[PDB]
Design a protein around this ligand. Structure first.
Ligand code: K6Y
Length: 322
């Protein structure tokens, strides 16, 4: 009833507010409007405009797949954080409906979103350790204890997302962000997310092909289990230093994903038996037989105990990939 009235109050200005307001407004995104969720990102006279009220840091340094994530400062408060830029014409409402209102240590905090012309600017906490995707490139591949340790947190955030019937859509190293000392890991980027009740309908952008579950490829119906397949492709990447499939096959990868057996051949043979068995359970081609988020987190927490807890230095020494 009053619903439609509240949306109208939000349109056309930028305000301090709360996640439910941000999602109300975000649903209308298919001049300068938006809601900021934290006291250190403040609008000025109904506006929040890039280079006026917030500046990107220095010569531009991008950091996502598309170089669309930047460091930024709020000009008035001096606060710093991260912007992801999204083209308004391709903006998926779920990128903010599916994550506004969340609160979880395993999930990157959302600071707001402001539309400004053709840009949806999405603001979040800046985590200084960078992405697990970078960590892997820097260090070659990760010690088994570290890889399990991060995989467990990733599954911890997938637990949170899943029992709220949210599917992240693109679990992968590039979307886990590490704290400054490397001890805390959090999921970012909901641009592939999907609220729950085939994936190949609607505003659907597909996720990273190498981490793509077999049901996702063959068109079949999809539930939270596709995240688990991905997290284990991520695991292999952490261990081997490269994505599954990229070695053995050259052509259109999604064809091999549906015909071939799950890529457990790529599990390092020096992994303790419970590492290997857990990677296998989250890589069952049929989502019914595949482990859930809660099962695999438990299973991985114990695999971590079996190899003596986490002992490797966070930025230890380089390790040659496969
Ligand atoms: C040093 N760290 C970084 O450069 C950094 C930060 C950051 N926050 O510092 N974010 C990202 N990156 C790296 C990793 C790449 C670029 C990357 C890609 C993304 F699509 C996103 C995102 C996102 C959101 C806005 O959909 C989101 C929703 C909810 C909840 O949380 N986030 C962030 C980052």
């Amino acid at each position: 009833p009053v619903e439609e009235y509240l949306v109208h109050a939000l349109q056309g200005s930028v305000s301090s507010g709360q996640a439910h307001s941000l999602a109300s407004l975000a649903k209308t995104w298919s001049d300068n409007e938006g809601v900021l969720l934290t006291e250190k990102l403040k609008p000025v006279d109904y506006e929040y405009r890039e280079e006026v009220h917030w500046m990107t840091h220095q010569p531009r340094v991008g950091r996502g797949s598309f170089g669309e994530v930047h460091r930024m400062k709020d000009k008035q408060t001096g606060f710093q954080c991260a912007v992801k830029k999204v083209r308004l014409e391709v903006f998926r409402v779920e990128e903010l409906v599916a994550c506004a209102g969340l609160s979880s240590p395993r999930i990157v905090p959302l600071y707001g979103a402001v539309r400004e012309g053709p840009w949806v600017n999405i603001f979040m906490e800046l985590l200084e350790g960078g992405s697990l995707g970078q960590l892997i490139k820097q260090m070659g591949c990760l010690p088994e204890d570290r890889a399990l340790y991060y995989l467990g947190q990733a599954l911890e955030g997938l637990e949170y997302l899943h029992t709220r019937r949210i599917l992240h859509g693109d679990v992968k190293a590039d979307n886990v962000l590490l704290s400054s000392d490397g001890s805390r890991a959090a999921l970012c980027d909901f641009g592939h997310a999907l609220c729950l009740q085939s994936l190949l309908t609607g505003d659907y952008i597909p996720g990273t092909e190498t981490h793509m579950a077999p049901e996702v490829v063959m068109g079949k119906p999809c539930d939270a289990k596709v995240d688990i397949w991905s997290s284990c492709c991520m695991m292999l990447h952490m261990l081997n230093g490269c994505h599954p499939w990229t070695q053995y096959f050259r052509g259109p990868l999604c064809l091999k994903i549906a015909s071939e057996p799950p890529p457990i051949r790529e599990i390092p043979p020096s992994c303790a038996p419970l590492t290997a068995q857990a990677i296998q359970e989250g890589l069952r081609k049929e989502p019914v037989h595949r482990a859930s988020a809660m099962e695999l987190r438990r299973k991985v927490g114990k695999a971590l105990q079996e190899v003596g807890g986490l002992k490797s230095p966070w930025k230890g020494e380089y390790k040659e990939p496969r």
